[PDB]
């Protein structure tokens, strides 16, 4: 608390006035209350009692000529006093000739008078002054610098280099007989000055070329202001008259000495430490050092961890050197903190740091590889992580199909029927507590063409704009329908394999005919779908039911693993058949049934498919990729064929067989790490199954009927050219499409253990036999053939540096 506020009466009446004087409140003499100086700022406290309620008014008065430090100090101190009195006082800002009535009532005796003048401002005025000087650079080996006492041609000669420092303009004047060494050092000195200041332009001028045409008009006008060219011829000294470069350097070198200001054992001693040459390591951070350059300059180097007495006495002793030696007033003494060394200070040291023996705004991700742990896959997933439906699907929906680049509304009798070759737009309208909300689904068929997908997207936006943009647009790809979309069709959806038109028109066969097969499958009680599949025996799956329409009668085939919900939709579909359904059980297959499917061939039937989820562990699919910068593997629940991407490799867990699906466009490192991860997968499985469970690799397009069975429906028209696995086997062959099994385990083999090939083979670029390490083709030579080619044994070759090995390989064409 400010001592000037200590004696303020607390809670009792008073009337006090202070005046701001050099950032401090000074009490005004009581007999002078009412006289305010125009150039000062005051603070007035009026604690008055009124019927038992204490009135506390605080005013700070600002004269019309009061300086900023006083107005600020008055405001700041007003707040201090207000807080010191508990904050109850009310603050008032009073300007001269416009004070409030309450402030004027305090001086109702007509005692309010404005006096002229005021106390001085406490602020120091920053001037930003320029030290214009004329420096000389002269020497033979290391040219030294000296500041001339005045700026005239009389201080210059034609055999040296001179610098005219004018602040932000620097003139380097090269004498007609200056040495090349002096020219180079003066430019370093000039560049050093400019860089220490951050701004400035070096203007190089030659002796004799001090003309407006050679320097520029504005550049010469400034030069002639401080060095008129008309006075040059009379006063400019000559080369010999300027002195010998050797003496000037010899004397200034011995002129330099280094003192030490140290406080050891509490004793301050000034000790001469060394002389020229001087090196930066001579300066210790724990003490202060004085760099004596005599009349040219005195520098005080203060270390970071010096002593306060060392800091003081170092400068006082340096300031004493000026008077003892009676140096001119031009000789200055500068304080140099450690880390703020200027170029001039460094120039006094022959050795400082070291030379520079050897940035892009674009930053490339640097992610180091990590080996993926397979145990994390066995740690079970969070299948129900994100779930959310806005209603129950009982709202209003309008369904449109993309026909002839436009929208055709589907009849209400066809709701729930979609064609896999077309795209649809469904406008869902649901209400919650009377507030209508809209969702625009556009469902894109797997074989829908670009024109139909585009119209579906464009007219989705148009309906959204017809509703003011209030609707939420949802993109839905076939086979990957969200839970709310399925609930709109009461969980039952029929996807006919077909389509219409496409970029003009074609054979838009309208209907599935009379002989078609339906694949009925569901992963829950809500996503039970019936999709049209080819009428072939391989299309059957033991986990699902199938509905076979024919002109003779409709048949329902119930696989061993089918659920009750799957059979119910199959019966309801077959209930529309005027012929009547004839349900069949797997195994109880009459021969007339197979004859309508081309005959019995191998179909999707495995232990995992026949069994119910109650006993077998459900199938799991893992997508492996290094496209994220590191090889990772993630599970896909409710996995279907659309979740397979050709750029990656997948792993399927089917209890008795673990498949490794190889995409055609996948990287080789992704394939190899996916197989190594599959081996680590079952080696860590604590479920107690066979440690040598079959682990086969399956190639994209050559998928067996049991691999496709774990997925939903399978479309051979994507990667198998529409051929079934049997039809592929007939055209290509069993050993042409065989599922090779993964096995453990080359690199780091010895020279003798590597397979050997002739030099005529390894030197070729293309058409090389398999199993040749292209990065170490010299190891594929014999011990004898290596010596003949490389002129040395492989043992001495590997001792040579890596740069020489690569060059030898390039010379011999084995790179």
């Amino acid at each position: 608390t400010d001592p000037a506020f200590r004696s303020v009466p607390k809670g009792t009446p008073c009337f006090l006035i202070w005046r701001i004087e050099n950032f401090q409140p000074v009490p005004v003499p009581k007999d002078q209350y009412g006289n305010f100086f125009e150039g000062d700022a005051y603070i007035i406290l009026s604690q008055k009692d009124n019927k038992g309620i204490l009135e506390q008014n605080l005013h700070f008065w600002l004269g019309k000529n009061s300086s900023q430090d006083e107005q600020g100090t008055a405001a700041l101190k007003t707040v201090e006093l207000d807080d010191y009195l508990g904050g109850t006082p009310v603050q008032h800002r009073e300007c001269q000739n416009n004070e409030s009535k309450l402030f004027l009532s305090y001086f109702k005796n007509k005692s309010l008078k404005y006096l002229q003048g005021g106390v001085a401002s406490g602020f120091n005025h920053v001037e930003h002054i320029v030290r214009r000087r004329l420096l000389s650079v002269k020497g033979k080996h290391t040219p030294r610098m000296e500041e001339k006492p005045e700026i005239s041609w009389s201080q210059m000669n034609k055999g040296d280099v001179f610098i005219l420092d004018l602040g932000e303009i620097i003139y380097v004047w090269n004498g007609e007989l200056c040495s090349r060494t002096e020219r180079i050092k003066a430019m370093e000195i000039a560049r050093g000055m400019r860089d220490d200041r951050g701004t400035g332009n070096i203007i190089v001028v030659e002796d004799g070329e001090e003309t407006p045409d050679d320097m520029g008009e504005e550049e010469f006008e400034v030069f002639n202001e401080y060095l008129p060219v008309a006075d040059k011829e009379a006063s400019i000294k000559s080369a010999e008259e300027g002195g010998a470069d050797e003496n000037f350097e010899k004397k200034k070198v011995a002129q330099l000495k280094l003192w030490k200001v140290a406080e050891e054992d509490g004793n301050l001693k000034i000790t001469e430490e060394a002389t020229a040459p001087l090196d930066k390591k001579m300066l210790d951070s724990n003490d202060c050092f004085i760099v004596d350059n005599g009349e040219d300059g005195i520098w005080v180097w203060t270390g970071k961890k010096a002593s306060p007495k060392e800091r003081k006495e170092s400068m006082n002793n340096a300031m004493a050197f000026l008077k003892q030696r009676n140096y001119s007033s031009q000789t200055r003494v500068t304080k140099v903190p450690e880390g703020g060394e200027s170029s001039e200070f460094k120039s006094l040291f022959k050795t400082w740091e070291k030379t520079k023996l050897p940035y892009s705004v674009n930053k490339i991700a640097q992610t180091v590889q990590t080996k993926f742990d397979a145990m994390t896959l066995h740690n079970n997933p969070e299948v129900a992580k994100e779930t959310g439906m806005v209603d129950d699907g009982s709202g209003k929906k309008k369904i449109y199909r993309i026909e002839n680049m436009d929208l055709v509304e589907l009849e209400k009798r066809y709701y729930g029927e979609l064609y896999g070759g077309d795209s649809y737009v469904i406008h869902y309208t649901y209400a919650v507590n009377g507030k209508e909300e809209h969702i625009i689904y556009y469902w894109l068929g797997r074989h829908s063409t670009s024109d139909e997908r585009g119209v579906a997207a464009a007219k989705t936006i148009e309906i959204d704009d017809s509703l003011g943009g209030t609707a939420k647009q949802v993109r839905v790809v076939q086979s990957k329908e969200p839970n709310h979309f399925m609930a709109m069709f009461d969980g039952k959806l029929i996807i006919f394999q077909g389509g219409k038109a496409g970029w003009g028109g074609h054979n838009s066969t309208d209907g599935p005919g009379d002989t078609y097969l339906l694949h009925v499958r569901g992963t829950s009680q809500y996503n039970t779908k019936a999709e049209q599949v080819p009428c072939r025996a391989e299309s059957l799956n033991s986990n699902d039911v199938f509905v076979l329409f024919s002109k003779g009668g409709t048949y329902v085939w119930a696989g061993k693993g089918c659920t009750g919900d799957e059979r119910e939709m199959a019966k309801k579909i077959a209930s529309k058949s005027p012929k009547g359904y004839i349900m069949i059980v797997e195994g109880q297959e009459k021969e007339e049934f197979w004859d309508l499917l081309g005959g019995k061939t191998e179909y999707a039937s495995d232990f995992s498919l026949k069994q119910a989820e109650n006993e077998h562990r459900p199938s799991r699919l893992f997508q492996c990729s290094n496209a994220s910068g590191v090889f990772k593997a993630e599970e896909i629940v409710d996995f279907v064929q659309e979740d397979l991407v050709p750029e990656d490799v997948f792993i399927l867990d089917a209890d008795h067989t673990i498949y490794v699906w190889l995409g055609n466009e996948a990287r080789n490192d992704e394939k190899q790490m996916a197989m190594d991860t599959a081996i680590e997968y079952l080696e860590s499985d604590p479920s107690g199954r066979d440690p040598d469970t079959p682990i086969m690799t399956v190639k994209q397009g050559y998928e067996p009927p049991d691999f496709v069975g774990h997925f939903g429906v399978w479309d051979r028209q994507l990667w198998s050219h529409g051929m079934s696995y049997a039809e592929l086997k007939k055209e290509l062959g069993e050993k042409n499409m065989s599922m090779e099994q993964v096995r453990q385990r080359n690199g780091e083999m010895s020279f003798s253990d590597v397979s050997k090939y002739p030099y005529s083979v390894l030197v070729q670029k293309e058409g090389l036999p398999d199993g040749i390490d292209l990065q170490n083709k010299e190891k594929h030579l014999t011990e004898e053939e290596f010596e003949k080619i490389f002129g040395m044994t492989y043992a001495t070759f590997i001792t040579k540096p890596a740069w020489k090995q690569t060059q030898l390989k390039k010379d011999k064409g084995l790179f």
Partner: protein, 361 residues
């Protein structure tokens, strides 16, 4: 049954054709040729001009200039020659009989849009016309209404985020770096080996080397080390002269300029940073859908491995819990035009057209 024309005014290639078609009927360079020595030869007068491939054949006697050098039309007198070549020479059709759908670059100034619509109505007398943003058409070609499109062509690369049909202009990024710069960068690093590609006819074969042997490395530092250890990445190319050259790290150093523009002396950021910055200048609610729909467009997005790399780079800048999906349509060299052919075939376009009567106001 009035058929509509769709013309993509590209920085290096004009893609024009008829609406309702699977692909553009004509694709020719966006180059106009004017005589070097006026009057010496027949067909080489002051008012004689040549456009397209014929200007490349007569390159030795023509000057050749790019009208739409950086996505924006700058020379309108040479632009009218391109559209004249499109209607009468390439498509072989009368412009006064067909409504025309034209494409503009992202952030095309209003003045350019007004001079385009004036030239079509007065110089060519089209019945109706409409201009469209190239990125929105590419998005429509992918069956999407929302996504952040990366359109990289010949002279310009643009990032355009779109949500539910409409783009967000304040988040559009622009990079003056594309295939023409990559073609020029391949010539430079090829001459560093001593193969000497400097002439224009040599730049034609260099452009072919770029489109056939270049790829985007997943880890640039690892592939640079692989290319210095063995010739496993080197591939050969046969020049028309029968001479065969070999390229090594130049295969992936050239497209790396898309991610490190400092290779050609540019201070700008890579295509991954401009995509990240474009999504980050959008509302946070829609950022989830933008990271899941990075639709690529343009001929310079055809390098193999560019999708994996864009994912690797974006996934490092995005939150770790983000699902990053890059879409690479197989026909993305013409996604702009295909989207235009779809839009111009919508029957609801008859209300979005700008008739000539409305323009005579």
């Amino acid at each position: 049954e009035t058929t509509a024309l769709v013309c993509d005014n590209g920085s290096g290639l004009v893609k024009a054709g008829f609406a309702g078609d699977d692909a553009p009927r004509a694709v020719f360079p966006s180059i106009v040729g004017r005589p070097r020595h006026q009057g010496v030869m027949v067909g080489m007068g002051q008012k004689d001009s040549y456009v397209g491939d014929e200007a490349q054949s007569k390159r030795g006697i023509l000057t050749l200039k790019y009208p739409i050098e950086h996505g924006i039309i700058t020379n309108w007198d040479d632009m009218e020659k391109i559209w004249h070549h499109t209607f009468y020479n390439e498509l072989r059709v009368a412009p006064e009989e067909h409504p025309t759908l034209l494409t503009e670059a992202p952030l095309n100034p209003k003045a350019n849009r007004e001079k385009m619509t004036q030239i079509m109505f007065e110089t060519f007398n089209v019945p109706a016309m409409y201009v469209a943003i190239q990125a929105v058409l590419s998005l429509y070609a992918s069956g999407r209404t929302t996504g952040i499109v990366l359109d990289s062509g010949d002279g310009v690369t643009h990032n355009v985020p779109i949500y539910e049909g409409y783009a967000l202009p304040h988040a559009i990024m622009r990079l003056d770096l594309a295939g023409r710069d990559l073609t020029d960068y391949l010539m430079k690093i090829l001459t560093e080996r001593g193969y000497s590609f400097v002439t224009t006819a040599e730049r034609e074969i260099v452009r072919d080397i770029k489109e056939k042997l270049c790829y985007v490395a997943l880890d640039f530092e690892n592939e640079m080390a692989t290319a210095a250890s063995s010739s496993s990445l080197e591939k050969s190319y046969e020049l028309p002269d029968g001479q065969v050259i070999t390229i090594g790290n130049e295969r992936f150093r050239c497209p790396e300029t898309l991610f490190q523009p400092s290779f050609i002396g540019m201070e700008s950021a890579g295509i991954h940073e401009t995509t990240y910055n474009s999504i980050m200048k959008c509302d946070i609610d829609i950022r989830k859908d933008l990271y899941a729909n990075n639709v690529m467009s343009g001929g310079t997005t055809m390098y193999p491995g560019i999708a994996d790399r864009m994912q690797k780079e974006i996934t490092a800048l995005a939150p770790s819990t983000m699902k990053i999906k890059i879409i690479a349509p197989p026909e993305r060299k013409y996604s702009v035009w295909i989207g235009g052919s779809i839009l111009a075939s919508l029957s609801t376009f008859q209300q979005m057209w700008i008739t000539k009567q409305e323009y005579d106001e």
